[PDB]
Amino acid sequence: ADLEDNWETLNDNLKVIEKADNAAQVKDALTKMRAAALDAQKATPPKLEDKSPDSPEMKDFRHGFDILVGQIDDALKLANEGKVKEAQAAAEQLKTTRNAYIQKYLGDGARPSWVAPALSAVLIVTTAVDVVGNLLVILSVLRNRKLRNAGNLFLVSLALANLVVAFYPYPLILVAIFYDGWAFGEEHCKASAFVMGLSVIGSVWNITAIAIDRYLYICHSMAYHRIYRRWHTPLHICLIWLLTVVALLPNFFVGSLEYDPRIYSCTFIQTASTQYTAAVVVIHFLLPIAVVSFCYLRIWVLVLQARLKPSDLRSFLTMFVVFVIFAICFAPLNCIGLAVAINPQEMAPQIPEGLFVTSYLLAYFNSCLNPIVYGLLDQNFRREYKRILLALWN
Amino acid sequence: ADLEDNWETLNDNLKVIEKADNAAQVKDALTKMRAAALDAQKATPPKLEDKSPDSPEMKDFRHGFDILVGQIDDALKLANEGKVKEAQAAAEQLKTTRNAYIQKYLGDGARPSWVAPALSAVLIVTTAVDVVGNLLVILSVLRNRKLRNAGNLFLVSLALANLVVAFYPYPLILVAIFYDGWAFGEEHCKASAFVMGLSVIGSVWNITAIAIDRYLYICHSMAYHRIYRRWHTPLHICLIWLLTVVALLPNFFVGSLEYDPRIYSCTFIQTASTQYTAAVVVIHFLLPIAVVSFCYLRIWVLVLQARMKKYTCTVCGYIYNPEDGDPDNGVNPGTDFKDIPDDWVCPLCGVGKDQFEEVECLKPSDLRSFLTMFVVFVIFAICFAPLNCIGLAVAINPQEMAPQIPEGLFVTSYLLAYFNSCLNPIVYGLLDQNFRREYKRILLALWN
Numbered sequence A: 001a002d003l004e005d006n007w008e009t010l011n012d013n014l015k016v017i018e019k020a021d022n023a024a025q026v027k028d029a030l031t032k033m034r035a036a037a038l039d040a041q042k043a044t045p046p047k048l049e050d051k052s053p054d055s056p057e058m059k060d061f062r063h064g065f066d067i068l069v070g071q072i073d074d075a076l077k078l079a080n081e082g083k084v085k086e087a088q089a090a091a092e093q094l095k096t097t098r099n100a101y102i103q104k105y106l107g108d109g110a111r112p113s114w115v116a117p118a119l120s121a122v123l124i125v126t127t128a129v130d131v132v133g134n135l136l137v138i139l140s141v142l143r144n145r146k147l148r149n150a151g152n153l154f155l156v157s158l159a160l161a162n163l164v165v166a167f168y169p170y171p172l173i174l175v176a177i178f179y180d181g182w183a184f185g186e187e188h189c190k191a192s193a194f195v196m197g198l199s200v201i202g203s204v205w206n207i208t209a210i211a212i213d214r215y216l217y218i219c220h221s222m223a224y225h226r227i228y229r230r231w232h233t234p235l236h237i238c239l240i241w242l243l244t245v246v247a248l249l250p251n252f253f254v255g256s257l258e259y260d261p262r263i264y265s266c267t268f269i270q271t272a273s274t275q276y277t278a279a280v281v282v283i284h285f286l287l288p289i290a291v292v293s294f295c296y297l298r299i300w301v302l303v304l305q306a307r308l309k310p311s312d313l314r315s316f317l318t319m320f321v322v323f324v325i326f327a328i329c330f331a332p333l334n335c336i337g338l339a340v341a342i343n344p345q346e347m348a349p350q351i352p353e354g355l356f357v358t359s360y361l362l363a364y365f366n367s368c369l370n371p372i373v374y375g376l377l378d379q380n381f382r383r384e385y386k387r388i389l390l391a392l393w394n
Numbered sequence B: 001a002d003l004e005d006n007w008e009t010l011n012d013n014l015k016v017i018e019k020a021d022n023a024a025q026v027k028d029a030l031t032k033m034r035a036a037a038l039d040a041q042k043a044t045p046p047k048l049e050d051k052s053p054d055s056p057e058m059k060d061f062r063h064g065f066d067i068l069v070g071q072i073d074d075a076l077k078l079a080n081e082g083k084v085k086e087a088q089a090a091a092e093q094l095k096t097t098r099n100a101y102i103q104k105y106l107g108d109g110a111r112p113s114w115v116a117p118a119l120s121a122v123l124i125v126t127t128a129v130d131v132v133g134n135l136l137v138i139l140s141v142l143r144n145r146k147l148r149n150a151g152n153l154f155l156v157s158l159a160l161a162n163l164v165v166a167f168y169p170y171p172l173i174l175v176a177i178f179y180d181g182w183a184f185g186e187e188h189c190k191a192s193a194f195v196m197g198l199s200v201i202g203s204v205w206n207i208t209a210i211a212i213d214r215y216l217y218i219c220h221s222m223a224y225h226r227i228y229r230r231w232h233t234p235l236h237i238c239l240i241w242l243l244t245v246v247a248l249l250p251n252f253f254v255g256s257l258e259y260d261p262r263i264y265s266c267t268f269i270q271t272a273s274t275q276y277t278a279a280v281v282v283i284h285f286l287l288p289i290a291v292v293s294f295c296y297l298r299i300w301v302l303v304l305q306a307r308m309k310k311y312t313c314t315v316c317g318y319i320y321n322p323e324d325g326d327p328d329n330g331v332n333p334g335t336d337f338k339d340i341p342d343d344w345v346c347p348l349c350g351v352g353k354d355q356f357e358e359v360e361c362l363k364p365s366d367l368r369s370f371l372t373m374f375v376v377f378v379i380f381a382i383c384f385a386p387l388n389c390i391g392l393a394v395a396i397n398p399q400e401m402a403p404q405i406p407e408g409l410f411v412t413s414y415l416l417a418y419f420n421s422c423l424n425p426i427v428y429g430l431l432d433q434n435f436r437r438e439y440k441r442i443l444l445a446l447w448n
Ligand SMILES: COc1ccc2[nH]c(-c3ccccc3)c(CCNC(C)=O)c2c1
Pocket: A193, A194, A196, A197, A198, A200, A247, A248, A251, A267, A268, A270, A280, A281, A333, A334, A337, A360, A363, A364
């Protein structure tokens, strides 16, 4: 039997012992566990495959199994006596506890089998739709005199924020999944973690700048037309990106950019400094999500009081949906970060790995959604996407 | 303008409204449609040519146009307001009435009398064996944990490709034969046509994924085992199905999913865009048929050379398995017997490799059933080679080569292609001993 296959066997019967109602169900499960333990001990690990069978690295895995075999025999000594709870306790609090004391028996039970293929599928799809999708957005906005419309600079600003992350950190996390551990230097670690901070942080500030601009243009159009914009807009875009770089610099002093084995990515660590992460969740999420929720509620009340035409909603509809799609995508992880920011000594271990990865899978997915919402809601973008593709077939 | 000519005009502008990006493109198409409707109303139908101009049969066609002109005016009332999707939708309610009320008079309904009973017989039999047959393969693979891990996780994926089509488009077509024309909405039309595209396209990528899998397992055995798999193949299966959905999306922009009266089925149209169909025939048939013919040529050369054969011991009877090796005495799994050094001995009696003879006859279950899998590939190719040839001939020159495709031949190509949805569970049962055993275990448990 295969080592990866035998690893699944020992964990499946471990789950059975918990959901068991009688000592015979337990004694049956503990027999399959001891048999699959001795088979996997005869097998060679993948990381230490080149190492000697007597080497201090390969003989460490062999010995780890010897401890659990005796622990299983100890547990079935109780299950034979008809003591169900007594053996059910000697299973979970001994097969897992000594696994951390054996190290190599703790790695398989740390991460679920599903995160590696789910993450890699999500990143492949996200990177693919990102490059094509946002590259179309760039080209659509560049043609003829389209750039003379200032607001189109915000679509190029967000297109690059989405884009840059697909060209540097996303490809290397995919190498980190297939190599099981970060395969590049400590240089590329903090640098990949930084550009993702630029994208995720830089995006909310563009999304906010838009919400204020579209708030004044619709609600106080008298005062809005009095104030210029043709040159104001490229100044505002430039300012938010330098503002972003500044907000990210405490990461190098507080040491919060390091590789997270749970998500195979070098990213920002919420436990490294609960002071910085508390500010990151407030000042760079709940603060902007609040002001923009306010901006767009004032716009929707005037539309509700105006009732209509498909060309009348055109001014903001596309930009409102992108904001909402952003909020959903980043609300879960910001909640995890908030719970850790209050009391990490007790609330942090209560965050399951299954939930944590689910928060990062959505947050990564957001890097490709924008051109889709443009295609589904904007007729003029849908037309533009068709023109570019036709240009390539003709 | 001629009545047959005006019927082509109203259907051409109907296609334009779908592929339209602005209300003006729609308002322009709806104006040409109303004009061509009033011209055809002034014309006499061919079936009711002998009838009186005021007769209840001839005045029925005149009134049918009055309704269509009213709803065209209703649709352009939306297109003037700048509501594109709202009028694009109200142009489908116009597509139904023009195909339920105006399909009565005119039209060349020249089909042979056999295309109805043959098609319906083939579909009934195909659907029946498809459901039972592939439901057995799904069951036997998840049931037996050993045969599942033998690279046969793509077989459940292939079987789901065969199944899905028996549950939605095949039953509908059968209603389309007994009702003589598509009896369901335009919604269920392009949708049923999509579900078939998923199966036929997804199957070749499933069949390719296995051909590569067995190619590396047999030819690059050493490097193979070095690379993980438990999480690799569910990622590969997931990738092929998204790959497939992607390849099918141009159908909604080029408008190639519509009902074909010759085959009573809403399917993909080869003439709607010869650019897309040329790619469909190349990228999704001749390209994969080529790479897999390459995969199986490099396997068959090893078999001919005897480079991956089992060796039975002429003394204690121990059989050497290249898939297994002799790991405890240094020969890691995947090693060929001809590659073991001379100092190796039988691990059961100590006789030298010197006194080992090869198993002459290679069973189809061997080397992850490469023989059974190769057969399925060949069957698939025969089943879809004719229609892909028709599609290729139409893709070059459709102005002259397309009318030269007889209806009798075209339906014959679709009859085989439909039949392919049920065959593979049979080829597994006839050639794989372990599947035949599993089939019996399923049948005997439900019976007893
Ligand atoms: C402040 O310095 C950095 C620096 C790097 C960062 N990378 C990410 C991130 C990247 C991709 C997907 C989700 C989050 C955050 C945002 C992380 N937010 C929370 C609440 O943990 C981040 C922040």
